[PDB]
Design a binder for this molecule. Structure first.
Ligand SMILES: *C(=O)N1C[C@H](NOS(=O)(=O)O)CC[C@H]1C(=O)NNC(=O)[C@@H]1CCCNC1
Length: 268
C-alpha cells in the first residue's frame, strides 16, 4: 500500500488556514527516498531565493573557466541598490566573484546578485543553467529588485517547491557539479546568516543546515530551502514557499518553520 497523502497533507492545510494564504512544501529523505509534498508543484515567487542557484551557476561556469571565482568585479555606484550590505562596503575596491557569491547567498546581497547575473548572461542565463540540470520549472525573468513583485497570477520569477528541492539535491548532494564546486556551494549555504528563524528553527542544533531564504515584502510571500545533515544519517533536502492573495497579507517566518517541522517529522 502507498502513503495516505491526505493524512500527510492535513496539517499543512490547517497551517495555511491560519496564515491566510498558500504554503508549498517538498521534502526529500535521500536515505529512504521518502517524501512529503503539499502544493509541491504550484508556482511561488522565488524572491531572493534564486541567489543560491545563481551561486551554483557561477560554480558551474568556473568548471569551464579556470579562475572565474578569483576574478575581480569592479563596479560603480549605480550597482548599489537597497539590501546590498556587503557590496556597499567595497565600492572603492571591487569584490571577487567568490566574495560576491558568498554575499549573495549568505547576506542575500541584491547588488551582488545583479552583478553575478550580468556575468552569467542575465536572468535568462541563470534560467538556462537550471534547464541544463533538468529543471523545467524554474524561471528567473527580471533583476533585483523588480523580480520581487510577487503579483498573484504572475509566473515570472517563480519556481515550485518540488523543482527547488530536486535541483538543490542534484547540486549539493548529486554529482551535477564537480566535487570541489559542490562542496563550495554547500559551504556557502551552511554559512547563511538570514535563515535562523526558518527551516533552521525546526532542526536540532547539533545537525548541520545550509539554506537560502527569500522575502519579497508583499503578498505574504517568503521562503526557505535547505539541506539538513542529521548526524550519521542520510541528508534531507526541503523547500518551504508561501504566498497570499492580498498585497498587505503578512509573511510569517513562524509559519515557514512550522511547515518545515511538519515536513521533517512526516518523512519515512
Ligand atoms: C530577498 O528576498 N530579499 C533580499 C534581502 N534579504 O532577505 S532574505 O534574507 O532573502 O529573506 C531583503 C529581503 C528581499 C528584498 O530584496 N527586499 N526588497 C524587496 O523585495 C523590494 C522592497 C519590498 C517590496 N518588494 C521589492
Amino acid at each position: 500500500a502507498t502513503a495516505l497523502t491526505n493524512l500527510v497533507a492535513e496539517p499543512f492545510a490547517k497551517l495555511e488556514q491560519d496564515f491566510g494564504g498558500s504554503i508549498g512544501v517538498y521534502a526529500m529523505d535521500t536515505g529512504s527516498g521518502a517524501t512529503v509534498s503539499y502544493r509541491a508543484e504550484e508556482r511561488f515567487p522565488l524572491c531572493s531565493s534564486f541567489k543560491g542557484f545563481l551561486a551554483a551557476a557561477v560554480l558551474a561556469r568556473s568548471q569551464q573557466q579556470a579562475g572565474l571565482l578569483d576574478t575581480p568585479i569592479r563596479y560603480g555606484k549605480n550597482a548599489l541598490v537597497p539590501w546590498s550590505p556587503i557590496s556597499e562596503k567595497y565600492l572603492t575596491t571591487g569584490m571577487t566573484v567568490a566574495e560576491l557569491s558568498a554575499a549573495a547567498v549568505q547576506y542575500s546581497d541584491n547588488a551582488a546578485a545583479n552583478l553575478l547575473l550580468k556575468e552569467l548572461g542575465g536572468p535568462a542565463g541563470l534560467t538556462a543553467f537550471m534547464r541544463s540540470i533538468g529543471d523545467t520549472t524554474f524561471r528567473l525573468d527580471r533583476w533585483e529588485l523588480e523580480l520581487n513583485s510577487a503579483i498573484p497570477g504572475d509566473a515570472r520569477d517563480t519556481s515550485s517547491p518540488r523543482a527547488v528541492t530536486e535541483s538543490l539535491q542534484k547540486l549539493t548532494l548529486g554529482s551535477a557539479l564537480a566535487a570541489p564546486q559542490r562542496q563550495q556551494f554547500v559551504d556557502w549555504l551552511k554559512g547563511n546568516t538570514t535563515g535562523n528563524h526558518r527551516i533552521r528553527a525546526a532542526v536540532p542544533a547539533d545537525w548541520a543546515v545550509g539554506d537560502k531564504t527569500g522575502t519579497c515584502g508583499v503578498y505574504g510571500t517568503a521562503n526557505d530551502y535547505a539541506v539538513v545533515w542529521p548526524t550519521g544519517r542520510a541528508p534531507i533536502v526541503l523547500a518551504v514557499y508561501t504566498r497570499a492573495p492580498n498585497k498587505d497579507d503578512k509573511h510569517s517566518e513562524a509559519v515557514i518553520a512550522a511547515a518545515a517541522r511538519l515536513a521533517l517529522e512526516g518523512l519515512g
